[PDB]
From Swiss-Prot:
Phosphorylated by FAM20C in the extracellular medium. Binds water, Ca(2+), Na(+), K(+), fatty acids, hormones, bilirubin and drugs. Its main function is the regulation of the colloidal osmotic pressure of blood. Major zinc transporter in plasma, typically binds about 80% of all plasma zinc. Major calcium and magnesium transporter in plasma, binds approximately 45% of circulating calcium and magnesium in plasma. Potentially has more than two calcium-binding sites and might additionally bind calcium in a non-specific manner. Residues 2-183, 184-376, 377-574 form the Albumin domain. This is Albumin. GO terms for cellular component: cytoplasm; extracellular region; extracellular space; protein-containing complex. PANTHER family: ALBUMIN (PTHR11385:SF15), SERUM ALBUMIN-RELATED (PTHR11385).
Length: 579
């Protein structure tokens, strides 16, 4: 309408508006205290209500970015506190939002929130709205690129948990297992949305548009290309809006897309009956995780249109992106077992083949073989998953994680020891997730989770570029990232770190930590060992690692740090003896 704040408030409703505004403020101004934020959401919400009352209340006409910008800037200590974002207050309307958005911290040094069952449950009975707000503020401040509409679903789910478990005598019993499941789901959606955001910022809307085509074409295999093009344009709008920090418009357009899908359900998928009889936020979430419908029976062979047809060249030249769009759609619909990443890589490779062949004379010769050429791209991933998965069966999660740490520290030896231990740990957890699965679904889960883990590596490394090899793999292409990292060979030009007792000296306290924490400490030492000696043999690293479990077991077993000092040093002295 005339006033966008009015339009958005009538469409979203006070409750969702207030939450979405808090999620926005919390995501941009990530360090400020919760109560300061609530004071601001309140004022903007009052302004919103004032607009819907009279659509001329001096200022109602401004853009949503002028309004949010203005309020954000009036936060004194934007310079003191969150810091150089205060520089950005100076600028005018387009530049203002862009600089603020650039000042999003993906690894904010904010506390890890330990849940306290009873305290939390009392905080709920006090005021439920505040409790819902604190959940939002907390997850948004720690994951600055979260899908605003989904954070709202997750918060409704958190309120539901406390509804059930607070009335229960044993609070932690109920709360702790349920909250931990939800935290895992929340962390995966953050990573997934950070991948969509990184795709739009670095690789273009073409890349988000093409991942959408694949995702949507796999899941909705009956949809004709017309409808998938419709959905992809509307879904890409939503992702582009959430990634740019236009959270109010993200939610309105996501809601509108779900209304659409549910209304046009006969054409889109037979599995959407259950999802579309639910309430607003749960409908949109249920639609995103829906069962891939059945591949329509008697679909042509893919060779027909994209290889054997004689006029392939004409068609591609006529309308490049529609043709390469149709390849992704037709291929993704026929192969629901491939991962989206592999499908996108197969389409990139078809684009390449077509360019080469389409310039050269006798293009039909060139292009008929395109499918045999593309078999390679499907096979390499399948061989990786078999090989790695075989290794996880032999070693267990911690054994697998440890051997992953040795592989990737040999490869990209310059990445911070804390980030090497985080990616290695997350990659070994892809053994638990993905390697006990039906063969059909193994490739989707592995390649999809690997992409999220590798995008985290890439995001964390962009902050402090240290390894040239990582920068090359993360900047080249989004789809070719996992293939690029698996192709990286042990670096024969890394000048070792240096013998340093400080990193390898294990003090007691290991014998008392949380087990997850004990694992990380011990894995952190593996990375430092590999950096002092890049040129070790596995046989030697076996000798060293068996000896270290001796020191931890022997020491912890016994009576003190005393031993954890007398004998540490000897192990250092034996490790050094060889490795």
């Amino acid at each position: 309408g005339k006033s966008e704040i009015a339009h958005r408030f009538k469409d979203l409703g006070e409750e969702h508006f207030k939450g979405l505004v808090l999620i926005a403020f919390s995501q941009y101004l990530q360090q400020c205290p919760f109560d300061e934020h609530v004071k601001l959401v309140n004022e903007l919400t009052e302004f919103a209500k004032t607009c819907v009352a009279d659509e001329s209340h001096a200022g109602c006409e401004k853009s949503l970015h002028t309004l949010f910008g203005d309020e954000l800037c009036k936060v004194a200590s934007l310079r003191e506190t969150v810091g150089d974002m205060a520089d950005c207050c100076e600028k005018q309307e387009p530049e203002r939002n862009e600089c603020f958005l650039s000042h999003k911290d993906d690894s904010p040094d904010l506390p890890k929130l330990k849940p306290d069952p009873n305290t939390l449950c009392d905080e709920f009975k006090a005021d439920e709205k505040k409790f819902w707000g604190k959940y939002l503020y907390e997850i948004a401040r720690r994951h600055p690129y979260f899908y605003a509409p989904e954070l709202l679903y997750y918060a409704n789910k958190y309120n539901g948990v406390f509804q059930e478990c607070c009335q229960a005598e044993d609070k932690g019993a109920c709360v702790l297992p349920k909250i931990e499941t939800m935290r895992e789901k929340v962390l995966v959606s953050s990573a997934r949305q950070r991948l969509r955001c990184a795709s739009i910022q670095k690789f273009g809307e073409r890349a988000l548009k093409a991942w959408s085509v694949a995702r949507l074409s796999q899941k909705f295999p009956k949809a004709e290309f017309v409808e998938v093009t419709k959905l992809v344009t509307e879904l890409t709008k939503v992702h582009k809006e959430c990634c740019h920090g236009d959270l109010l418009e993200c939610a309105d357009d996501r809601a509108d897309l779900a209304k659409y899908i549910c209304d046009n359900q006969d054409t889109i998928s037979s599995k959407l009956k259950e999802c579309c009889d639910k309430p607003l936020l749960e409908k949109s979430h249920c639609i995103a995780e829906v069962e891939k419908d059945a591949v329509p029976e008697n679909l042509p062979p893919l060779t027909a249109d994209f290889a054997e047809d004689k006029d392939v060249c004409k068609n591609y030249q006529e309308a490049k992106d529609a043709f390469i769009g149709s390849f992704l759609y037709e291929y993704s619909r026929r192969h629901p077992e491939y991962a989206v990443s592999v499908l996108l890589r197969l389409a990139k490779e078809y684009e390449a083949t077509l360019e080469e062949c389409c310039a050269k004379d006798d293009p039909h010769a060139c292009y008929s073989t395109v499918f045999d050429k593309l078999k390679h791209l499907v096979d390499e991933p399948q061989n990786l998953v078999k090989q790695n998965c075989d290794q996880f069966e032999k070693l267990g999660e911690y054994g697998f994680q440890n051997a992953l740490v040795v592989r990737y520290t040999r490869k990209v030896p310059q990445v911070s020891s804390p980030t090497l231990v985080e990616v290695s740990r997350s990659l070994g957890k892809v053994g638990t997730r993905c390697c006990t699965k039906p063969e059909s679904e193994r490739m989707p889960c592995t390649e999809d989770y690997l992409s999220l883990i590798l995008n985290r590596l890439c995001v964390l490394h962009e902050k402090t570029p240290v390894s040239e090899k990582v920068t090359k793999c993360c900047t080249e292409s989004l789809v070719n990232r996992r293939p690029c990292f698996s192709a990286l060979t042990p670096d024969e030009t890394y000048v070792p770190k240096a013998a340093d007792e400080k990193l390898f000296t294990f003090h007691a306290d290991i014998c008392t930590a949380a087990d997850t924490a004990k694992q990380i400490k011990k894995q952190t030492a593996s990375v430092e060992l590999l950096k002092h000696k890049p040129k070790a043999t596995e046989e030697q690293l076996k000798t060293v690692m068996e000896n270290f479990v001796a020191f931890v077991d022997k020491c912890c077993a016994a009576d003190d740090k005393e031993a954890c000092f007398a004998v540490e040093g000897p192990k250092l002295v034996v490790s050094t003896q060889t490795a």
